[PDB]
Paper text:
Here we study primary-active transport via P-type ATPases using functional and structural analyses to demonstrate that four simultaneous residue substitutions transform the non-gastric H+/K+ pump, a strict H+-dependent electroneutral P-type [name], into a bona fide Na+-dependent electrogenic Na+/K+ pump. P-type 2C ATPases are obligatory heterodimers formed by a catalytic α subunit and a auxiliary β subunit. While the [name] is electrogenic, generating an electric current as it extrudes three Na+ and imports two K+ per ATP hydrolyzed (black ions), the gHKA and ngHKA export H+ and import K+ in an electroneutral fashion (cyan ions). The exquisite ion selectivity and stoichiometry characteristics of these pumps are determined by their ion-binding sites, formed between transmembrane helixes TM4-TM8 of the catalytic subunit.
The Cryo-EM structures of Lys794Ala and Lys794Ser in the K+-bound E2-Pi were solved at 2.80 and 2.99 Å resolution, respectively. The global structures of these mutants were indistinguishable from WT − ngHKA. In contrast, Lys794Ser displays two strong densities at sites I and II (valence 1.03 and 1.07, respectively), representing two bound K+ ions, as reported in a similar gHKA mutant. First, Na+ augmented the activity of both mutants (Lys794Ser at [K+] ≥ 0.5 mM, and Lys794Ala at [K+] ≥ 10 mM), but not of WT pumps. Transient currents were small in WT- and Lys794Ala-injected oocytes, but much larger in NKA- or Lys794Ser-injected ones. The Q–V curves are sigmoidal for NKA (squares) or Lys794Ser (triangles), while the small charge moved by Lys794Ala (diamonds) and WT-ngHKA (circles) lacks sigmoidicity. While the alanine mutant mediates electrogenic transport of 2Na+ or 2H+ for 1K+, the NKA-mimicking serine mutant mediates electroneutral transport of 2Na+ or 2H+ for 2K+. Asp945 forms a salt bridge (dotted lines) with Arg949 in the E2-Pi structures of WT-, K794A-, and [name]-ngHKA. Mutation of lysine 794 to serine or alanine reduces the ion selectivity of ngHKA, as both mutants can be activated by either Na+ or H+, but neither single substitution suffices to flip selectivity.
Residue numbers in the entry:
A (entry chain A): 51 to 1036
B (entry chain B): 28 to 304
């Protein structure tokens, strides 16, 4: 960690520090010693835990601890049974079933457990294999790994930098820092200390960056992980192991359920122990409690529903790498998004053009076919000709049918933008360019900042010479003697100069690259047609031009970005733009896209409007803030928190990846779920750190995709709002499913408590409740996930992570006490009906379990005096258990019907709106019929055939459940916030 | 707060009171259908089971005649059962009637209605259980190799056993078949090996027949016919191998009577006896 950057040092200082020479360089022996000391020039991959370890760790998450305890208790009970000879068995079956359930839940959780993998492979395209290094005063190609700090390296054009080097001898070297800043604009390189910040020093080449053109010589100052790219990779890979909000909510729900189960088990175990109960019965009852209290199929159902939502979203061209990412989006409070490539097409295009003393607006859509901006007016033909002729960019071959915007052009970015504009508006420039016999003299230089090209018109009448000029507007103007307005070349005046200056000021303030265009006519008297020309600028004039027009390029935002941003903001999500671009362009794009409202103004804007010093203006009035990289650098965490809290709309510019990660962390410190959208390597740390990271598909780099939880294959920003809606809907449906499962949990639990307390014959067996959990409750639980939104999802604000939980106290109270007890009562009614009709009245069943289960007794007397054998008693017990199970299923049908909506009535939501509900009801009925008749026809698993009437005994109780829930929801709707909404609403 | 707690507690009290009221109302509505005289269904207890008096733990009867404590449990249980069969308990003629001493056809004593008050019961005297009545015999039969078990048929309300038809020969010529008014009962070694050591079996029943007389049935449910005395059939072996465990199965033969593999006590016995010398 060498953070003491050294770029201000001169050549002699560098030589003294690293003990090397520019001409000589590091010696081979010295190079080997340095390799041994420091190490190879490579990025060390992160340590990855074996997938087997993760799979086994998945065997203890959730309720698996309780299931393992239950299996151990079942084995103990079976051992006790074997000791005291008893061929009952039925415990090994329970143990095997519990073990299989644990295994299945572990597998489902593993398939739901993120993706892991590594991100170092993403840098394969970068990280050049070999480099040219001078050793012993000689140049020899050496592998990049063997490269060590101190040796002299030379980089030509079109090759990756071998390592972080400090340029010493550069001749017009240009490099691309898209990896660091995320901007593809070439950056000039030199050998002087330009900027204090090393990232902008302008005299330091960076590892894995590409040298666009020119040649330079540099001294290695960093290697491997010590390089900037190495540190970014370390941040991206190392960090990123955290629990998503959905996982935290699931853990909280598991904690609640496990605590309830453990507390009930302890209390009732102590009670049974203090009631003169054999340890065997105590352990059996403990196993029953554990089975009843643990919803086995809930977690697998959650995984299945998440997978279904992921499949639908992928069908919507929104790939989801991590399964929990579907829910993570939505319930998000802050969105930190990159400017270039994410909110912008990343393609330089002409937006505004000023001529005739008035401003025009040009279409900036990527799929646009053509646009019109008062083209009928004069002075437009001259501008079109000047743009078409005065250009060097060319289309790549084989792009006839390819869209012109999507075509590839071999030239400068601005040149490509003008070429695209001319193709869109004018037509095919190839024929136009061919018509005019352009003169090879096309001198353009950085110092000149103008380029002119002599042309001869193809008009038969005129057939005269045409000179075209463009460049920096100021020098173009000062080479302009007259200005042509609507055809006439009005001489340049003070008024015209002032208007031009004002237009240039406004265009520059809109953060656009303004370029001036001017041409002159050459009468045949001075320069005849055969007159020969020289590019040395001596054969032709270079002044007294006629200014024609002015236009700028902005790199406009994506077509759908503004609408998506507006919808996200209206949905209560705060949008923050973090970019590595210049503050002016960032502010302009933020205003255009809608991150900053039109009426809202920054403190600098307020000061400018009031014509006062910035310190004088109070910060309260300003509702928007633009913070550069340096200000964030010299900002304590408290100041950052205050800034985030106080300002609704914030724009960050010139931020390094570390600063992006700092911003993400600061946002997360406000108890807010943050989602980061990016498409660049510099976004990798932020994408990893953020709760959900969305990476742009087509424009995104491999690193962004690998470090992103979600990928937008089609690069449409409306997928963000779609995902927000899907996440909120998933949250609601998960609440409904959890309540549905808990209701049946309590319904199963109550009978065992009654059996222990009142000593009734076992109303229901453990295997029956296992069948309830893993059978009839699967399809209904999945169907509840298909429910439509009851109200407008977007209108609601994002849910607070702390205050709002997936499973709250009201939900548990309603599911456990309110609806669970109703189902228990219905089941007990059916049980008593079953027993009474066979000769056992309800009062005779009190404290009858001890004699009931005694295998020795074969003449037990019922209420009518009849005597029952042991087997007949247990067959009646199985019939009662089956009746209880059927009653539970029947009441669970009404439970599902009521649970399909939380506030609306069934009449409003529509009974048949969701067909998966009816599929689930049919599944419940079919499973019950199979278990009762197919199984049970031969008595197995405590199942027996049931009489017809025993199916319909519990219907009135289901009707009562539905009526009660409907009345509750009706009174909630009638009186909002009237002590009924506060308590009853869940 | 206190007020909110009071409101919530009141709501829950009312809600649970209403739930309990609904539950008890549904239970009472269901109970209205059932009748206190006869059960609605007799699916489970339709074919009556066969059970023994000594009420042994695991179908095992092991004892040593020398030590009284070995057979004290069995003797005490048998005495406890037979207590109500003494002639003193049947001295009252208001409810006990001296029915025929010879087996007769089942006598319908009315219908299952609250009218006609109660029903009289044909009394059963212990004298018919010769060698096992306990009147003259002491400790019943549990002297040296004389185990005695009393076989009884599980009471089923409104059930009239049908003795096997003479169409097919039940077993070895019974001579005293008398199928019109006797339900045959036979005891034999469970497996081929046991038959060798089981020795001979002595049956003591009413009138000398080896079965339950039909005059006692049908039973009327302990409400219309309280103090009902079911017929008994005492079985005594009097000769069996010593220090060897014998599996003995007792079976009741009748067209109405049924059998099942799942239920071993449905019209059949599985009893193991071992007299430790
Ligand atoms: C005899 C055998 C009976 C068997 C029947 C089944 C019994 C099973 C019962 C289970 C109940 C489980 C309760 C789960 C609690 C979760 C804890 C938790 O993490 O909750 C989170 C909440 C968050 O709330 P918030 O900030 O969103 O609220 C905002 C309020 N606003 C709107 C005013 C601003 O924290 C809170 O509210 C505080 C929650 C405190 C919960 C106290 C529970 C007290 C005791 C319950 C035992 C019930 C016995 C029933 C006996 C029945 C016999 C017939
Ligand atoms: C997709 C969502 C819905 C899932 C529904 C799952 C339902 C599972 C129920 C299966 C019961 C099938 C019964 C078929 C019996 C045919 C008998 C003939 O005739 C002599 C036979 C002795 C039979 C012993 C039992 C054999 C097989 C049943 C095994 C079931 C195990 C289930 C464990 C998980 C609850
Ligand atoms: C066990 C207990 C199970 C029973 C428990 C609950 C049943 C409650 C009764 C059913 C619910 C009421 C009927 C209902 O609310 O209907 C509504 C729909 C029409 O709503 P919409 O689309 O015009 O709303 C438009 C909304 N806006 C105005 C915003 C555009 O009416 C329709 O579609 C046509 C059907 C309406 C007529 C009633 C049909 C009754 C049939 C079945 C009930 C469920 C029995 C389940 C038994 C087990 C089956 C195996
Ligand atoms: C508004 C629309 C929904 C209305 C409610 C629908 C659900 C309840 C309605 C009917 C359920 C019972 C009837 C089911 C269909 C008829 C099946 C049946 O045949 O059912 C008869 C049993 C009573 O049979 P039994 O004594 O006449 O048979 C004598 C047999 N033998 C002659 C051999 C001695 O009816 C019984 O169990 C009655 C059980 C009493 C408790 C039921 C719950 C009462 C709560 C209210
Ligand atoms: C945690 C537990 C808290 C509660 C504990 C309660 C303990 C009660 C124990 C003993 C009290 C006995 C006092 C009455 C006996 C004499 C009167 C009599 O016996 O009348 C009985 C009838 O009763 C009634 O009509 C009222 C209903 C009484 C139902 C009692 C059910 C007992 C079962 C309780 C378990 C409930 C479990 C619920 C759990 C829910 C969890 C959320 C006898 O009718 P029968 O059979 O002769 O009718 C024959 C037919 N017919 C009437 C047409 C002639
Ligand atoms: C009379 C008896 C049967 C009532 C038993 C009620 C018991 C089971 C209830 C009452 C209070 C409940 C606890 C309330 C708060 C918490 C903290 C939470 O982080 C885990 C669940 C846990 C620990 C609950 C478990 C269940 C609980 C202990
Ligand atoms: C009858 C006795 C013995 C057992 C049942 C007691 C009932 C009334 C108790 C047990 C648990 C209690 C609830 C526990 C938690 C809450 C959440 C709180 O924000 C409002 C009160 C409320 C909703 C309580 C209401 C009363 C309650 C339901
Ligand atoms: C058994 O009874 C018979 C008469 O039925 C009697 O002769 C015999 O002596 C009795 N048994 C014993 C051991 O006395
Ligand atoms: F396009 Al960027 F940081 F501005 F990735
Ligand atoms: K359960
Ligand atoms: K992430
Ligand atoms: K459940
Ligand atoms: Mg980008």
């Amino acid at each position: 960690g060498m953070d003491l950057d050294d770029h201000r040092l001169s050549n002699t200082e560098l030589e003294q520090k690293y003990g090397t020479n520019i001409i000589q360089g590091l010696s081979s022996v010295r190079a080997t010693e340095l390799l041994a000391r420091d190490g190879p020039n490579t990025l060390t991959p992160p340590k990855q835990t074996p997938e087997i370890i993760k799979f086994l760790k998945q065997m203890v998450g959730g309720f698996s601890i309780l299931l393992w305890i239950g299996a151990a208790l079942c084995w103990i009970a079976f051992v006790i049974q074997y000791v005291n000879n008893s061929a009952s068995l039925d415990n090994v079956y329970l143990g095997a079933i519990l073990v299989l359930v644990v295994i299945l839940t572990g597998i489902f959780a593993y398939y739901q457990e993120a993706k892991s993998t590594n991100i170092m492979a993403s840098f394969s395209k970068m990280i050049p294999q070999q480099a040219l290094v001078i050793r012993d005063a000689e140049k020899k190609v050496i592998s990049a790994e063997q490269l060590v700090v101190g040796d002299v390296v030379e980089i030509k054009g079109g090759d990756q930098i071998p390592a972080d080097i400090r340029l010493v001898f550069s001749q017009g070297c240009k490099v691309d820092n898209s990896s660091l800043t995320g901007e593809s604009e070439p950056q000039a390189r030199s050998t002087e200390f330009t900027h204090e910040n090393p990232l902008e020093t302008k005299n330091i080449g960076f590892y894995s960056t590409t040298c666009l053109e020119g040649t330079a010589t540099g001294i290695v100052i960093n290697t491997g992980d010590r390089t900037i790219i190495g540190r970014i990779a370390s941040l991206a890979s190392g960090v990123g192991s955290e629990k998503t909000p959905i996982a935290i909510e699931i853990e909280h729900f598991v904690h609640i359920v496990a605590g309830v189960a453990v507390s009930i088990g302890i209390i009732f175990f102590i009670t049974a122990v203090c009631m003169k109960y054999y340890v065997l019965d105590a352990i059996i009852f403990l196993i029953s409690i554990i089975v009843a209290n643990v919803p086995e199929g809930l977690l697998a159902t959650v995984t299945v529903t998440l997978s279904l939502t992921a499949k639908r979203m992928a069908k919507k061209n929104c790939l989801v790498k991590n399964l929990e990412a579907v829910e993570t989006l939505g319930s998000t409070s802050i969105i930190c998004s990159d400017k270039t490539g994410t909110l912008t097409q990343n393609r330089m295009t002409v937006a505004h053009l000023w001529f005739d003393n008035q401003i025009f607006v040009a279409d900036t859509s990527e799929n646009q076919t053509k646009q019109a901006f008062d083209q009928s007016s004069g002075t437009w033909a001259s501008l079109s000709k000047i743009i078409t002729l005065c250009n060097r960019a060319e289309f790549r071959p084989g792009q006839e049918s390819v869209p012109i915007m999507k075509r590839t052009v071999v030239g400068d970015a601005s040149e490509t933008a003008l070429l695209k504009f001319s193709e869109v508006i004018l037509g095919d420039v190839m024929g136009i360019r061919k018509r005019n016999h352009k003169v090879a003299e096309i001198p353009f230089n950085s110092t000149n900042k103008f380029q002119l090209s002599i042309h001869e018109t193809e008009d038969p009448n005129n057939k005269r010479f045409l000179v075209v000029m463009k460049g920096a507007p100021e020098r173009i103007l000062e080479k302009c003697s007259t200005i042509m307005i609507n055809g006439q070349e009005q001489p340049l005046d003070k008024s015209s100069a002032d208007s031009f200056h004002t237009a240039y000021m406004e265009l520059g303030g809109l953060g656009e690259r303004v370029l001036g265009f001017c041409h002159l006519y050459l009468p045949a008297e001075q320069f005849p047609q055969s007159y020969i020309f020289d590019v040395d600028s001596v054969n032709f004039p270079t002044s007294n031009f006629c200014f024609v027009g002015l236009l700028s390029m902005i790199d406009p935002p994506r077509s759908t970005v503004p609408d998506a941003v507006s919808k996200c903001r209206s949905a209560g999500i705060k949008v923050i733009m973090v970019t590595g671009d210049h503050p002016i362009t960032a502010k302009a794009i933020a205003k255009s896209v809608g991150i900053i409202s039109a009426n809202n103004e920054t403190v600098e804007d307020i000061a400018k409007r009031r014509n006062i010093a910035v310190e004088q203006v109070n910060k309260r009035e300003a509702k928007a803030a633009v913070v550069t990289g340096m200000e964030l650098k010299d900002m304590t965490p408290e100041q950052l928190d205050e800034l985030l809290t106080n300002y609704q709309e914030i724009v960050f510019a010139r931020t390094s990846p570390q600063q992006k990660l700092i911003i993400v962390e600061g946002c997360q410190r406000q108890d807010a779920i943050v989602a980061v959208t990016g498409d660049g390597v510099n976004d990798s740390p932020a994408l990893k750190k953020a709760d959900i990271g969305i990476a742009m598909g087509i424009a995104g780099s491999d690193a962004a995709k690998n470090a992103a939880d979600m990928v937008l294959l089609d690069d449409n920003f409306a997928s963000i709002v779609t995902g927000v809606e899907e996440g909120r809907l998933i949250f609601d449906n998960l609440k409904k499913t959890i309540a549905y499962t808990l209701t049946s949990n309590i319904a199963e639990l109550c009978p065992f408590l009654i059996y222990i307390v009142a000593g009734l014959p076992l109303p229901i067996g453990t295997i029956t409740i296992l069948f309830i959990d893993l059978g009839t409750d699967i399809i209904p639980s999945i169907a509840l996930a298909y429910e439509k939104a009851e109200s407008d999802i977007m209108n609601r604000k994002p849910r607070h992570k702390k205050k709002d939980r997936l499973v709250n106290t009201q939900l548990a109270i309603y599911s456990y006490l309110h609806i669970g007890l109703m189902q228990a009562l219905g089941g007990f009614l059916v049980y008593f009906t079953v027993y009474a009709q066979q000769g056992f009245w309800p009062t005779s069943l009190i404290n009858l379990r001890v004699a009931w289960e005694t295998d020795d007794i074969n003449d037990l007397e019922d209420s009518y005096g009849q005597e029952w054998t042991r087997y007949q008693r247990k067959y009646l017990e199985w019939t009662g258990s089956t009746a209880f199970f059927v009653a539970i299923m029947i009441q669970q049908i009404a439970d599902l019907i009521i649970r399909k909506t939380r506030r609306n009535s069934i009449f409003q939501q529509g009974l048949f709106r969701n067909k998966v509900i009816w599929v689930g009801i049919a599944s419940q009925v079919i499973v019950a019929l199979i278990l009762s008749y197919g199984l049970g026809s031969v008595p197995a698993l405590s199942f027996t055939m049931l009489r017809v009437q025993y199916w319909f005994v519990a219907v009135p109780h289901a009707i009562l459940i539905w009526v009660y829930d409907e009345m509750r929801k009706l009174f909630i709707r009638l009186y909002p916030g009237s002590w009924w909404d506060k308590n009853m609403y869940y | 707060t206190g007020g909110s707690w009071f409101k919530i507690l009141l709501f829950y009290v009312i809600f649970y009171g209403c739930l309990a009221g609904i539950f008890i109302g549904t239970i009472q509505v269901m109970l209205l259908t059932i009748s206190e005289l006869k059960p609605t269904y007799q699916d489970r207890v339709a074919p009556p089971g066969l059970t023994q008096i000594p009420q042994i733990q695991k179908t095992e009867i092991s004892f040593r005649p020398n030590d009284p404590k070995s057979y004290e449990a069995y003797v005490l249980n048998i005495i406890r059962f037979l207590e109500k069969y003494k002639d003193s308990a049947q001295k009252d003629d208001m409810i006990f009637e001296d029915c025929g001493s010879m087996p007769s056809e089942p006598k319908e004593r009315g219908e299952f209605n609250h009218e006609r008050g109660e029903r009289k019961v044909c009394r059963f005297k212990l004298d018919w259980l010769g060698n096992c009545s306990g009147l003259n015999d002491e400790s019943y039969g549990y002297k040296e190799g004389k185990p005695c078990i009393i076989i009884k048929l599980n009471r089923v309300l409104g059930f009239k056993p049908k003795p096997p038809k003479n169409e097919s020969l039940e077993t070895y010529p019974l001579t005293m078949k008398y199928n019109p008014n006797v339900l045959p009962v036979q005891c034999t070694g469970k497996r081929d090996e046991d038959k060798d050591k089981v020795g001979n079996i002595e049956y003591f029943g009413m009138g000398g027949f080896y079965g339950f007389p039909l005059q006692y049935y049908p039973y009327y449910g302990k409400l219309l016919q309280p103090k009902y005395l079911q017929p008994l059939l005492a079985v005594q072996f009097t000769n069996l191998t010593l220090d060897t465990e014998i599996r003995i199965e007792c079976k009741a033969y009748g067209e109405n009577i049924g059998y099942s593999e799942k239920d071993r006590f449905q019209g059949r016995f599985d009893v193991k006896i071992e007299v430790k010398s």
